[PDB]
Structures are given as C-alpha cells and as structure tokens.
Design a binder for this molecule. Sequence first.
Ligand SMILES: Nc1nc2c(ncn2[C@@H]2O[C@H](COP(=O)(O)OP(=O)(O)NP(=O)(O)O)[C@@H](O)[C@H]2O)c(=O)[nH]1
Ligand SMILES: [Ca+2]
Ligand SMILES: [Ca+2]
Ligand SMILES: [Mg+2]
Ligand SMILES: [Mg+2]
Length: 166
Amino acid sequence: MTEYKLVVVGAGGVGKSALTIQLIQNHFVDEYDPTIEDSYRKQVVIDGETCLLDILDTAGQEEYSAMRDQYMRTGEGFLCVFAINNTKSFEDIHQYMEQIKRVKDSDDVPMVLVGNKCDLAARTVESRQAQDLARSYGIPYIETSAKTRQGVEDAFYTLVREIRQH
Ligand SMILES: Nc1nc2c(ncn2[C@@H]2O[C@H](COP(=O)(O)OP(=O)(O)NP(=O)(O)O)[C@@H](O)[C@H]2O)c(=O)[nH]1
Ligand SMILES: [Ca+2]
Ligand SMILES: [Ca+2]
Ligand SMILES: [Mg+2]
Ligand SMILES: [Mg+2]
C-alpha cells in the first residue's frame, strides 16, 4: 500500500505526542511524558483509499539538532506544531520550517502549520499571525485541540492530501 512518511515537529510541550495519540489511539490523557523518538504505523482509509500512515513523533529538545536533520531528510510531509498559548513555540516553529527547507533543498515540501491547544483560554498567538506565516510558505494553517479532538483528523488528513496532490 501507499505509505505517507509524516513527521510531527515543534518545540517541547506543544502537544506533538498528544495530537498523534489522539489520531492513532483515540484518546487524550493529560500527563507529562517527553518524547525521545516514537514511531506510529497505522493503516487508514483516506478518501476511499487504503494507505499506511508512518508517523514519526519527534523530540522538542533543541539539543537533538543532528538527529533532526536526519528525520527531516527522510520525511515526506511535516506537521509543524506550535501551541496557541506559547508565543515562543510560534517563533521556534519558523526555525523548524526553515531547517526543513535547508535539509531537503526545497520550498515545496508538504507541510501543515498547526496551532494546538485551541481549547485553552490564555491564547497569545493570534490566528491571523499564524495564517500569514503559512501563507508565506504556501501551506495550510489548521488549529487543533488534542484534548477535545477538534481539528485533529483535519490536520493530519490535510497533510496527507498535501502530499498526495503534490
Ligand atoms: N489543554 C491542552 N493540553 C494539551 C494539548 N496537547 C497537549 N497538551 C498537554 O500539554 C503537555 C505537553 O503535551 P505533549 O503531547 O507531551 O507535548 P510534546 O510536544 O509531545 N512534548 P515533547 O517535545 O517533549 O515530546 C501535556 O501535559 C499534554 O497533556 C491540547 O490540545 N490541549
Ligand atoms: Ca541544503
Ligand atoms: Ca495546498
Ligand atoms: Mg512528545
Ligand atoms: Mg519551489
């Protein structure tokens, strides 16, 4: 079957794992559990076609810089996650997206910009700001809550469609 090599990237704590676990395991559990590197392979049906999502859940730590080049080199499309209540994570996601371009020698890499934690009241990143960033890359912006599941399928399936129609 067709495989989509998806990589979830973003600063520590933005909800990369929570999003992936909501997608794959249909649940949210509030807990502290930093990622080293986890892989999820899940056979789904998207628009009537069977495909394998191979999802790489990465670490937010800025100390794992070299291991970052390697999964960007081999990843197909990128879920670029920040949290809407964390301005620093929004500045950081710009750096991740530039790094993807450098490692992959392309500004045509399928990406979705994801503003996660949209259930929380203390928003510090306005949607329009994120929209402008995504527009400059030519990519979609989608807000998500791993807690409520709002937008989670949207974000991941939109990334798949961005690859499929690349
Ligand atoms: N309210 C709310 N909390 C969320 C959401 N997504 C994640 N969290 C919470 O935010 C914290 C960090 O989530 P986590 O998924 O571990 O983040 P991460 O980006 O994978 N971290 P790391 O880079 O260290 O692996 C956890 O307490 C988690 O429950 C969300 O959509 N809403
Ligand atoms: Ca290069
Ligand atoms: Ca598009
Ligand atoms: Mg994680
Ligand atoms: Mg181009």
